Amino acid sequence: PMDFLRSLDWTQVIAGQYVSNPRFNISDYFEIVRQPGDGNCFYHSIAELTMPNKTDHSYHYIKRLTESAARKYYQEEPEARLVGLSLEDYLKRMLSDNEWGSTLEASMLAKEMGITIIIWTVAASDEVEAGIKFGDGDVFTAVNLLHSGQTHFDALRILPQFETDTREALSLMDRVIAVDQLTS
Numbered sequence: 001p002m003d004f005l006r007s008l009d010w011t012q013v014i015a016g017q018y019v020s021n022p023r024f025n026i027s028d029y030f031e032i033v034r035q036p037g038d039g040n041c042f043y044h045s046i047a048e049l050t051m052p053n054k055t056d057h058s059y060h061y062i063k064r065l066t067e068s069a070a071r072k073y074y075q076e077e078p079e080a081r082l083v084g085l086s087l088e089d090y091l092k093r094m095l096s097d098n099e100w101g102s103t104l105e106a107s108m109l110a111k112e113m114g115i116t117i118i119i120w121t122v123a124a125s126d127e128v129e130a131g132i133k134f135g136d137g138d139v140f141t142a143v144n145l146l147h148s149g150q151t152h153f154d155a156l157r158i159l160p161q162f163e164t165d166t167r168e169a170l171s172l173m174d175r176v177i178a179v180d181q182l183t184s
Contacts, residue, residue, distance in 0.1 A: 113174065115137070
């Protein structure tokens with residue numbers, strides 16, 4: 001139970017990025033906090049979990065931190081080689097409304113916010129297909145997201161019975177950083 005979560009076997013495949021394939025049902029360990037399927041649900045899901053007063057607009061802070069992270073990190077992200085756009089053309093697309101966030105955003109955000117993000121993928125049941133972890137923290141301290149369908153992200157909160165640590169939180173400095181991007 002607690003043993004199970006503590007026994008997750010992560011393999012690092014890319015620097016700072018791991019994968020695992022435990023086989024367990026999301027609903028045995030997590031509450032799924034559903035997010036609207038509007039193309040911004042990656043960032044809704046992160047907001048849900050890092051801003052204790054999240055609304056339907058708070059994702060703007062996460063996207064702005066994604067902009068901040070990109071300016072610092074995109075040029076050196078392996079996955080940016082595949083995305084291929086200049087930083088400027090990428091920001092334009094990434095900041096467009098309803099433009100999905102993905103593994104590249106997760107990678108940069110984990111660095112910008114100094115958090116560990118885990119994406120748990122499922123396909124037509126809630127049994128996990130794979131876990132993908134950005135950052136070196138463990139499941140109890142991570143921002144846990146659920147990815148389902150081809151496209152959709154939801155937030156996951158560890159069930160109270162297993163929750164341990166204090167939680168990751170958008171700092172006040174984060175909101176300042178976020179607002180800074182906006183005005184520039």
